[PDB]
Amino acid sequence: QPEPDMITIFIGTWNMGNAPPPKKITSWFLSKGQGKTRDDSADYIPHDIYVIGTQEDPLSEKEWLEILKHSLQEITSVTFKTVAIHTLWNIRIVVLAKPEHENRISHICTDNVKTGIANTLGNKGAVGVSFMFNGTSLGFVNSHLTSGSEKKLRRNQNYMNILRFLALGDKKLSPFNITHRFTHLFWFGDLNYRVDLPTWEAETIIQKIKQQQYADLLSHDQLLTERREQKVFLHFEEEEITFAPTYRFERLTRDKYAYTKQKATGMKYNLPSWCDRVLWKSYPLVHVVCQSYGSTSDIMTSDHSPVFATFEAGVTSQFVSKNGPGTVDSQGQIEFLRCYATLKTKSQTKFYLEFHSSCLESFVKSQEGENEEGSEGELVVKFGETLPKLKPIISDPEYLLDQHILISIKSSDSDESYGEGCIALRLEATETQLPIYTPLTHHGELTGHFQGEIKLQTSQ
Ligand SMILES: Clc1cccc(CN2CCOCC2)c1
């Protein structure tokens, strides 16, 4: 039985509005409704992994697991295995996988982050799950961010707290937050960003939605505008939105948006908005293709509609050779030529690099770089030809060209990372000097760049 080099992943996000679900929710898992929808000819084909995020979920874990598993069994005639379930307050994540994947899945990690302080601590935050699928690391974050049209900055702050403090993946990757720990990271939830138009325009917005004319609404979506201004979700991707706003509906129909201020809303308007979203970030040059992104039309218990997204995702096998794992393979090496970091910092410590990769027995520390002044004010840290030669565990190009090197640039004075990035080994050539590049971030914000040349030796 061959190991896969692709899987499909279902992501769902649903703010249930504290109400039990209706008796049938299969349209959600079938990617049927509005937006980019899944072909009918695929209905019986199970996804490999289903990741379900709920917010305002009133059910026990047991109650929801029974609904989810029976829903998938009805669709696919497969009894899915439960990989993980984690709940913070009424924010929940469930991971289900086809039984054939049970021995391919390992290193399962769950965590949560509570956002806010005092007033603002007690119902918002995030849950997450990570695991290995053969040679590929997968992370999944379900967040419920701060509500209200005039709180986009609080949402951005919530995002940064979650990516700093959610403890998923390989704890040996100490300099790296969740935005660098996974081959594929999916971040979804009730992110609660709104369409920023005047309240007086509510009926105009509703008109536009009835005409399926979303362009003038999406141009005011706060998540798209904040992302374009690099205020949040830097280096994440989102499929184009082609479904109606998923909030705020009158319950038991989808015919009416309920936007007017009420005591129950704290006297706040809820203009129709794309609160419910799926984003992802994958390592450079790894296959990831969104195959659906939409909302259901027939699940009406909540004031939100469920959102679905599906993905093809490249995966690799758990590689064994006659040498590594358990030793190096002298036929493999990774060299860096003419490398330099450009940093936005005003500080003047010496810096060194750390190279982290599951193709190395352990991480590698460089010598300190040489600091120079850039012509536009910047710190340039030069490594020249001084970077250590990296010794991979396996030299076979079928393995090595699918790997990635994480880079942290650290202060010699404090050993704190000033920037993190990632370099793909999926090169155009081996034994050839080739340009490399990554942006550097710290706490998910841009802090600089790393560029230079690489030379990769494989056994071929
Ligand atoms: Cl699908 C799945 C569900 C629950 C746990 C696991 C991890 N496994 C790996 C091998 O079997 C034992 C534990 C996988």
Side-chain angles (χ1 to χ4, degrees), residues 2-460:
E3 297 305 308
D5 75 348
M6 213 89 101
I7 58 171
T8 74
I9 300 175
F10 177 94
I11 306 299
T13 183
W14 186 27
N15 179 321
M16 296 175 72
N18 303 112
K23 72 170 162 281
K24 186 171 183 73
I25 59 171
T26 58
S27 59
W28 191 17
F29 308 120
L30 290 175
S31 292
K32 303 297 180 70
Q34 285 179 331
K36 189 184 182 77
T37 63
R38 181 163 186 243
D39 284 340
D40 296 332
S41 68
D43 285 359
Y44 303 148
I45 300 173
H47 295 294
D48 294 286
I49 303 178
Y50 291 77
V51 186
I52 308 85
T54 51
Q55 313 84 34
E56 304 188 39
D57 181 338
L59 301 179
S60 67
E61 288 183 352
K62 171 178 182 173
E63 286 168 334
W64 190 218
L65 282 168
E66 192 195 316
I67 289 161
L68 295 173
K69 292 199 156 183
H70 286 145
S71 294
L72 295 185
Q73 183 144 99
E74 177 158 282
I75 292 160
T76 67
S77 302
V78 174
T79 304
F80 275 79
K81 296 289 190 193
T82 307
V83 174
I85 180 165
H86 190 68
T87 309
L88 165 68
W89 297 316
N90 299 98
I91 311 164
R92 179 175 291 153
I93 184 166
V94 181
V95 178
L96 304 177
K98 302 183 57 187
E100 71 190 72
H101 297 325
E102 182 184 351
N103 238 53
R104 296 179 170 129
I105 292 172
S106 71
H107 300 82
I108 301 159
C109 302
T110 62
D111 199 22
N112 61 264
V113 169
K114 301 171 171 180
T115 56
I117 48 166
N119 275 257
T120 71
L121 196 152
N123 74 292
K124 295 310 193 290
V127 292
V129 176
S130 68
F131 53 92
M132 292 296 301
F133 184 99
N134 284 338
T136 300
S137 59
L138 298 177
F140 302 92
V141 179
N142 173 23
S143 63
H144 191 182
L145 308 184
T146 293
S147 63
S149 66
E150 317 303 302
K151 299 189 171 174
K152 79 189 180 191
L153 166 68
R154 283 291 176 264
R155 291 185 272 281
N156 300 344
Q157 290 165 346
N158 294 157
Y159 164 82
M160 180 183 292
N161 288 316
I162 291 158
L163 73 87
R164 285 180 67 179
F165 298 123
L166 200 63
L168 294 175
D170 178 4
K171 307 317 189 260
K172 288 181 178 176
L173 295 178
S174 59
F176 303 100
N177 64 59
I178 54 164
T179 73
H180 285 119
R181 285 188 176 192
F182 307 106
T183 318
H184 303 285
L185 172 61
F186 296 93
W187 190 324
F188 48 95
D190 180 1
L191 310 188
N192 249 322
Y193 293 92
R194 309 307 179 92
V195 170
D196 216 338
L197 280 170
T199 315
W200 57 263
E201 293 282 41
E203 288 297 327
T204 305
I205 294 163
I206 289 164
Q207 298 207 307
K208 296 294 195 195
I209 300 167
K210 289 176 169 175
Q211 295 171 92
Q212 300 179 66
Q213 287 176 20
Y214 308 133
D216 299 332
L217 304 183
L218 288 165
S219 70
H220 294 270
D221 174 79
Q222 293 167 335
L223 182 50
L224 294 181
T225 60
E226 291 296 272
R227 275 175 26 76
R228 193 180 284 281
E229 291 181 37
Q230 294 182 36
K231 302 302 195 80
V232 78
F233 281 102
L234 184 61
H235 304 142
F236 280 74
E237 300 191 63
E238 190 187 22
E239 180 61 279
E240 185 183 346
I241 294 168
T242 64
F243 48 101
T246 57
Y247 182 66
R248 179 177 179 250
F249 289 102
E250 189 186 307
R251 295 176 193 237
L252 308 184
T253 180
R254 294 293 80 157
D255 290 346
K256 185 183 288 152
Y257 286 96
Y259 66 81
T260 201
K261 61 180 190 179
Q262 290 275 272
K263 289 189 257 167
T265 67
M267 305 301 298
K268 292 169 210 305
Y269 288 96
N270 290 295
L271 296 182
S273 289
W274 288 279
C275 287
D276 307 300
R277 305 292 272 267
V278 177
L279 299 91
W280 72 97
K281 179 181 183 188
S282 298
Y283 284 170
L285 298 179
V286 181
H287 183 84
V288 55
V289 180
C290 181
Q291 291 286 40
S292 71
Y293 190 36
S295 63
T296 62
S297 307
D298 58 346
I299 299 170
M300 299 171 291
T301 50
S302 180
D303 50 6
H304 297 245
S305 285
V307 164
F308 48 82
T310 59
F311 298 87
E312 306 181 339
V315 289
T316 61
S317 296
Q318 297 186 51
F319 212 98
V320 178
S321 76
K322 67 188 189 207
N323 300 305
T327 190
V328 294
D329 187 339
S330 55
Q331 300 168 74
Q333 51 176 70
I334 315 170
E335 302 179 279
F336 298 91
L337 288 88
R338 301 173 56 173
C339 289
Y340 59 96
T342 303
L343 298 186
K344 299 181 186 292
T345 191
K346 288 163 205 188
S347 102
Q348 255 296 350
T349 179
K350 291 190 176 170
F351 291 97
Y352 63 92
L353 301 180
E354 291 184 359
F355 302 92
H356 289 67
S357 181
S358 49
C359 78
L360 308 175
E361 283 199 307
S362 69
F363 79 83
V364 177
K365 278 155 133 58
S366 82
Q367 288 198 297
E368 291 173 325
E370 290 197 333
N371 294 355
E372 328 169 22
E373 171 89 46
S375 81
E376 262 174 299
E378 323 94 278
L379 181 63
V380 173
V381 184
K382 191 160 153 181
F383 294 96
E385 322 285 304
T386 70
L387 294 173
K389 185 187 313 181
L390 305 178
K391 293 316 180 98
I393 58 165
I394 290 161
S395 61
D396 182 339
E398 295 249 51
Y399 166 82
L400 198 48
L401 289 162
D402 281 347
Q403 307 302 311
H404 293 80
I405 310 299
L406 291 174
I407 299 179
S408 169
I409 184 160
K410 285 177 139 192
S411 160
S412 291
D413 291 349
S414 70
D415 293 308
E416 70 200 308
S417 184
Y418 278 56
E420 300 100 57
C422 182
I423 303 298
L425 299 188
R426 190 164 278 170
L427 310 188
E428 288 296 345
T430 61
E431 303 178 314
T432 302
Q433 282 163 38
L434 290 171
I436 58 169
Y437 170 73
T438 183
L440 295 174
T441 62
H442 188 67
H443 301 164
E445 294 197 329
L446 193 69
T447 57
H449 311 273
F450 182 82
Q451 59 209 282
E453 292 176 324
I454 201 167
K455 198 165 95 82
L456 179 66
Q457 195 154 137
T458 71
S459 63
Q460 283 304 120

